[PDB]
Subunit: 275 residues, 3 copies
């Protein structure tokens, strides 16, 4: 039944896995340093490996200068055997979470833990490794999604994605935090492979701070950005300004409607177009 | 302090296993606890009756020669509550989805829910589309499920982002061809909802679309806004910013700019005459 | 090759426990390590002094008859760094929130932060709204916290998405009534920020909104763009795409299309006369 370590003194009760490389050498990159897993009963035997598991793995070869280590969680899909178990959750050594559900990556790529390592594993991929260390990556066939299920209860269904801007840093000892600075952006858009590589977003919606903030003044804009056919340059086209003006983002450049996409009727207090 | 451990000196792996069976040597069952690791804290003169924080390995379907299904959950106990009210907040499904279900999101009865399919079975009125299973992250929260992206500037700029990354090909097979973004690529940010019978497709959205195929010197895009009319169930493109930067209605001679009691104050255009 | 394990042949669960106490048989404390599992790699002639990758169970509040609070963190060590600089990158809070805090996001001192409330206590100048605790995912990163949605086409189409899912009712109680999307349903995608005193509500946003209540034959929506003016702290609806697809200002006789040095090039409309 139950089983356990007890520390009565007030210290910690910790379980360790100790591993070495071949012939007392340093433990290696992507070596399984430790594991915990369930093995289910088939009727007369257990499965040959874990069907669900926690794995601790080496990140780079160990040395006096590298103690690199990362984590994955493995699951087995219903109707599949342990041959087809999936390392669906990967907490990278950089601190990124990769979520890779069933059907997203082949077995061969089970040790992929970053853009850098994905690039090495799939030479044609060429994603920007500058994105490593930024947060969550989801890889799924065709349609990777985030679903935000929001039952009303007695309030209102109000799911949200919220950027939170600030000046300063939480990384140092001082930890100064201050007012949103000018140049603050929140981009929601799409990058893609161009046949050679992934790069910057090429179409987007962005919330931007309209200058610096203070307690009585927090100005924003919402900007829509696209890229033209024959071009690789994402540009601001139309925006809602801080004062609420819907405006083109350059003077005398962008049209409202076209020949075969004409506005039905325009409603404006002033009947004359200001030129 | 009271450390404890397995050691493999040879170079092999040091792994801890949990072995479980069904009743009377039968196959282990669906949602059966196959293994667990958990802390039990000291109350003064006893420990808690169960773990207050735990990792659980669970069966997905009854085990057979054809099914070795298994999934994971992580359990926490909220401050000011007892283990009676512990929360399986993190659920890594057998399909590979992560479900995040914070305190107050789901009743105890739904602690074994690991998919839309299983949620549909547990709550018959729910009827979400199970086609969404296997797609990634699901967050269930009372009223306001959120993602917060906290972005301290440092010496650069506060630049939080949500980034779709389009490509041709597949990472799933042995060949693993990857290529240029294809026409018909989309990134939808919108809302589905229950219509009193079921959840379905998004009914209002902003979308980034590829404007055809991409190549090294040409990566065209559009931003489209889509809504659904009263008395209708059909989400339609209404207004978009085209690749060349034109703000346009998405159909000819259909949509107005402004209305009788929502009039633009003044229109600024270089050409003072409306092109009909 | 090595292995090690518990076996329950009877059909019961094989569970591993960690038992911990406070000092002198007292209650176990807030943020006390209640249990841990960790790898310790070989340096050539010794192991590392602590785990380089680990699962930790931790107290949330001091334990009592009324509090059994516990939470979870996962720790990793970045390549090219020693265990001195290991990162508690994954934090599943006692409230059930997931915090994702990659390398370089937070100092060592903040390793035990598990909520906005605790972050606020640790960094007094921070002042984020604790009303956001319990809502789901938080990502903290230097400058650019991101979510990447990598979408290989295969034989279909690259269609990454962020999907709100509105419903009436609750999954939290025993009844678990679920029903039609209600009026006042919203999906906000926008930015809050520090104003020099605190974080507060979003100050610029895009929102998908239900245009009233839904039924099986009627699921109306709008897309609204909201900004805040210089010298003001009030986020206001400015322009929206209505359910019938009208692009409209959100107040009558208030907002302009274009300005003096930001003029529309040419306006295309079927009717050449502006309806006043």
């Amino acid at each position: 039944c139950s089983f356990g370590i007890e520390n009565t003194a007030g210290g910690s009760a910790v379980f360790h896995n100790y591993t070495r490389g071949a012939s007392n050498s340093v433990t290696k990159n992507n070596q399984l340093l430790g594991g915990y897993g369930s093995r289910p009963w088939l009727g007369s035997t257990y499965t040959e490996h874990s069907n669900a598991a926690l794995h601790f793995l080496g990140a780079g070869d160990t040395s006096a200068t590298n103690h690199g280590g990362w984590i994955r969680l493995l699951v087995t899909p219903k109707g599949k055997t342990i041959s087809d178990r999936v390392p669906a959750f990967r907490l990278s050594d950089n601190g990124d979470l990769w979520l890779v559900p069933d059907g997203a990556m082949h077995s061969d790529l089970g040790l992929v833990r970053s853009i850098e390592t994905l690039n090495a594993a799939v030479p044609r991929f060429n994603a920007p490794s500058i994105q490593d260390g930024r947060g969550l990556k989801i890889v799924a066939p065709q349609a990777p999604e985030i679903d935000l299920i929001a039952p009303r209860g007695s309030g209102a269904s109000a799911p949200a994605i919220r950027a939170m801007w600030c000046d300063g840093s939480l990384a140092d000892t001082t930890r100064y935090i201050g007012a949103t600075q000018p140049g603050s952006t929140f981009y929601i858009g799409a990058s893609g492979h161009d046949g050679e590589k992934f790069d910057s977003m090429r179409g987007s919606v962005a919330i931007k701070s309209a200058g610096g903030w203070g307690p009585t003044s927090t100005p924003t804009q919402v900007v829509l950005e696209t890229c033209e056919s024959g071009s690789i340059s994402r540009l601001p086209r139309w925006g809602v300004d801080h004062n609420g003006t819907l405006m083109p983002m350059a003077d005398n450049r962008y049209n409202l409607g076209w020949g075969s996409g004409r506005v039905k009727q325009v409603y404006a207090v002033n009947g004359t177009i200001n030129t």
